[PDB]
Every structure is written in structure tokens, then in C-alpha cells.
Design a binder for this molecule. Structure first.
Ligand SMILES: O=C(O)c1ccc(C(=O)O)cc1
Length: 259
């Protein structure tokens, strides 16, 4: 049996839920306490009886704070993850810096006194919105040990992601005028290795800021991706393979069935 499985068997409704089966608590990392990032909030399950949990770091985008991504923290953590939503050192940091700060936030979790005993430090993942999604790709491109990467409406000047060895879900917004999918999201998917475990999901009718308020499509497939690749939880592959039926999804492609 897979020792990383957490929670009961999933359904479409269970991954769509605003809160999963794990009650969550939170702790704050101040800007002064944070080495190499701007502080953040750590959301974690309070129930330890099923074992430790994988860890996820999430970055906002250009001219955006932690509040623009905060909703993802408890929504993902309540499914069985330790999740840190960060502020960046400055609001004008570019994607490569945001990726370095995602790595710094993950490094911070390893010695954080509140969550040290709740994390599996060998099972880690990065996500981000807009420039923060570019940062998530950069972080994975600099660390082949990361288990999942999820850029949401990602923005980056770098279009070639052939160095990435981390399973990646690219979430685009169909009507994005800031990080249009043709030159950002889909370009990133296409340059990821053709044999990587990867998927492209486009949100029908969505604008650039879809990730900054609760979006159930984003949440459900982000949760399924983290389960499948941070926990190796095969119970969640059913939601990723084949192309979802969601009317909310205007385009999709993947390297299903996953390795
Ligand atoms: O004006 C830009 O080029 C630009 C604006 C916002 C973002 C973001 O939302 O991260 C990225 C790029």
C-alpha cells in the first residue's frame, strides 16, 4: 500500500469542496523572520494520526500580495498538505526572483518549529499566479527534486522549459490579456519535455485574475495534481485522465496515463 495516502477515497464533490476532511490551523512567518522571502502564512492539518504531509509553497504575481492567493492555502491544506502562501520581498519582483523565494520558503519550512514535525521534507511542490507562476516554473527548473509545479496564468519572459523534470499542470485563462496563453501558458506546456508528466488546462471565458478569488475548477484540479504527484496517490488520477468534461474547461491536453 502507498504510505502517503491521506483522507478517504475522493469524489468529484470531495475535491470541489471549499474545505477537505482535515481541520486546519495556521501560523505566521513575519517579514523579519523570513530568510529570502517576504513572510507568509502556513496552513497545516491539525490531525497527525495519518502521518506527515507534503508541503506546497504559493507565490502571488506582479503588484500583488499574499492576500491575492490566500484562499488557496486552507482550501488545499484541508485536503492534507502543509501550505505556505508568501509575500515577496517587493511587489515588483520579477519571475526568477519569485522562484528563488519559493525555494527559500520551502527551505524555511524544514526548520519551522510549528510545522517541522508535520511535514515530509522530501515531498515538496510549488505553485503561483502570474509572475508567481513563472516563478514556480523557475523554481522547478532549478530543483529536480520538487514533486509538482502549478503555474496559474503564468507569466515569464523565458519560454523554454525543457530543463524541467517536475510534473507540471499549466492552468491558463482563455481570455487572459496580461499573460495570454498563446505566448505564455501554452508555450510553457509545449516546451516542457514531451515525455514529462504534464497537463494543460484552459479556463473557459476566464480573465487574468481568475486565480485571485475562489475558483472551483482551479482548486479541484490543483488538489488532484498535488495528490497524484506529491502523495503518488493513484486514487486521484481518475480526475486528470482523460480530458475533464467541465464546461469550465475550454481546452485540455496531457501525457496521460501518468508515469
Ligand atoms: O505589465 C506586465 O507586463 C505584467 C503585469 C502583471 C503581471 C502579473 O500579474 O504578474 C505580469 C506582467
Amino acid at each position: 500500500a502507498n504510505p502517503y495516502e491521506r483522507g478517504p477515497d475522493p469524489t468529484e464533490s470531495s475535491i470541489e469542496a471549499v474545505r477537505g476532511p482535515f481541520a486546519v490551523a495556521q501560523t505566521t512567518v513575519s517579514r523579519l523572520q523570513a530568510d529570502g522571502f517576504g513572510g507568509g502564512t502556513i496552513y497545516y492539518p491539525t490531525d497527525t494520526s495519518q502521518g506527515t504531509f507534503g508541503a506546497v509553497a504559493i507565490s502571488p504575481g506582479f503588484t500583488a500580495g499574499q492576500e491575492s492567493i490566500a484562499w488557496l492555502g486552507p482550501r488545499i491544506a484541508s485536503q492534507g498538505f502543509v501550505v505556505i502562501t508568501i509575500d515577496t520581498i517587493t511587489r515588483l519582483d520579477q519571475p526568477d526572483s519569485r522562484g528563488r523565494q519559493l525555494q527559500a520558503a520551502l527551505d524555511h519550512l524544514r526548520t519551522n518549529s510549528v510545522v517541522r514535525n508535520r511535514i515530509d521534507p522530501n515531498r515538496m511542490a510549488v505553485m503561483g499566479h502570474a509572475m508567481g507562476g513563472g516563478g514556480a516554473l523557475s523554481a522547478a527548473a532549478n530543483n529536480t527534486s520538487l514533486e509538482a509545479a502549478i503555474p496559474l496564468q503564468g507569466w515569464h519572459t523565458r519560454k523554454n522549459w525543457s530543463s524541467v523534470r517536475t510534473p507540471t499542470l499549466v492552468v491558463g485563462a482563455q481570455l487572459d490579456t496580461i499573460a495570454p496563453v498563446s505566448s505564455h501558458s501554452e508555450a510553457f506546456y509545449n516546451s516542457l519535455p514531451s515525455d514529462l508528466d504534464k497537463a494543460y488546462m484552459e479556463l473557459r471565458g476566464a480573465s487574468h485574475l481568475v486565480s485571485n478569488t475562489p475558483d472551483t475548477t482551479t482548486a479541484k484540479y490543483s488538489i488532484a495534481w498535488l495528490k497524484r504527484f506529491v502523495d503518488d496517490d493513484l486514487r486521484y488520477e481518475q480526475f486528470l485522465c482523460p480530458a475533464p468534461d467541465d464546461f469550465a474547461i475550454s481546452e485540455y491536453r496531457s501525457t496521460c496515463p501518468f508515469l
